[PDB]
């Protein structure tokens, strides 16, 4: 037993150092004015609600199941209701520390993934078990796809409570490697945890292209133009906006507006953002794009089109985050149909 993971801590406890230390001392863990505490904070210096308490381990190495039960019960009793306490071994401690690091440095990783040249090289893997990290994803890809990828360009999607999501984005070194990963990783059985020297639990992973990234100065305020925007790519290099309007009309695509996207280098393919009047029109156009893909025989995982959506923004001055703002009414832009 290396430590404890405390989740869903209240903001008061997370922010007040003295309160947390006093709670741990009452529970039994001696926190120096020994056990060590590490909070999960983002680049904005805001606690995510997760804490890691590493027990003193020149002596706790002799702890047993009864000691674990007693300490966990005391911690659960002391800590506020609604916050969960879990026991973490050395592997869990490593995973937690890596998760905190990636949470802090997510923005830079997202920008690096969004470098326009990597448009066709990012692969999305889901559902990745929580115990997995970048090294585990690399090993899994090597084993089940015979593809080697950098273990430093793997990005985990995070949740509002600071816990890692079940989605990974991996930057394959080549489009061939990305296609190989897509073809190989489909319903692949994967161990969930290593315990007692065996592999426990099976999760069936899949790969696809469901999260495309683009970081550029020409698109920062593009999404704000309209809520119904469809990105498309894979067209010939030299086609301009008017020529593409004519081509779309010929193909029976009826966008309200067209905006060409060009980046330094890579003129072999032209990318366009289409804008529509209604979410219904956007969805029907996406359905027709799927039909045209199938009739054109291009790769089912080939990057052809997608639905534009600005990533959630969080600013230092904000008191209520836009993603966490319960007053949002954007759903009125998407009428429901059966």
């Amino acid at each position: 037993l290396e430590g404890f993971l405390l989740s869903n801590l209240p903001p008061e406890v997370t922010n007040n150092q003295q309160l947390l230390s006093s709670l741990l001392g009452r529970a039994g863990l001696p926190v120096p004015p020994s056990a060590s505490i590490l909070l999960q904070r983002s680049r904005l210096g805001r606690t995510a609600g997760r804490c890691l308490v590493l027990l003193p381990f020149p002596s706790s190495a002799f702890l047993t199941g009864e000691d674990r039960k007693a300490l966990q019960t005391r911690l659960a009793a002391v800590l506020p209701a609604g916050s969960t306490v879990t026991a973490c071994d050395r592997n869990d401690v490593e995973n937690c520390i890596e998760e905190f690091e990636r949470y802090f440095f997510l923005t830079e990783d997202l920008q690096r993934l969004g470098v326009p040249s990597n448009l066709r090289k990012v692969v999305t893997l889901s559902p990745v078990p929580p115990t997995y990290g970048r090294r585990e994803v690399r090993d899994l890809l090597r084993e089940h796809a015979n593809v080697d990828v950098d273990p430093r360009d793997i990005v985990f999607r995070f949740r509002k409570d600071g816990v890692q999501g079940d989605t990974c984005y991996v930057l394959c070194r080549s489009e061939r490697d990305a296609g190989v990963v897509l073809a190989r990783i489909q319903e692949t059985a994967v161990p969930n945890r290593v315990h007692y020297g065996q592999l426990f639990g099976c999760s069936f992973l899949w790969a696809s292209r469901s999260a495309l990234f683009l970081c550029d100065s020409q698109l920062d305020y593009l999404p704000a133009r309209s809520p119904f925007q469809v990105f498309t790519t894979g067209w010939e290099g030299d086609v301009s906006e008017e020529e593409f309007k004519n081509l779309a009309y010929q193909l029976r695509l009826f966008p309200k507006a067209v905006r060409k996207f060009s980046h330094p280098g890579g003129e072999d393919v032209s990318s366009f953002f289409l804008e529509f009047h209604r979410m219904r029109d956007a969805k029907l156009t996406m359905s027709r794009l799927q039909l045209l893909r199938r009739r054109w025989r291009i790769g089912a995982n080939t990057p052809f089109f997608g639905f534009l959506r600005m990533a959630d923004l969080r600013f230092e001055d904000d008191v209520k985050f836009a993603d966490e703002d319960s007053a949002a009414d954007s759903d009125l832009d998407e009428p429901i149909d059966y």
């Binding site: 889901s126 559902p127 079940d166 489909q186 319903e187 069936f204 899949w206 149909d337 059966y338």
Partner: protein
Amino acid sequence: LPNPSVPRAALVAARFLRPPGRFKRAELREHPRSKTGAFANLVK
């Protein structure tokens, strides 16, 4: 025992999707069975 694997994203996105009727159910179990997806064999 388990159901065919499907993403949680699809689970969430099918929230308002009306389930098939009698004839639409009958159309899913015909023998030509052209609608079956990848890793979605009923028997296997």
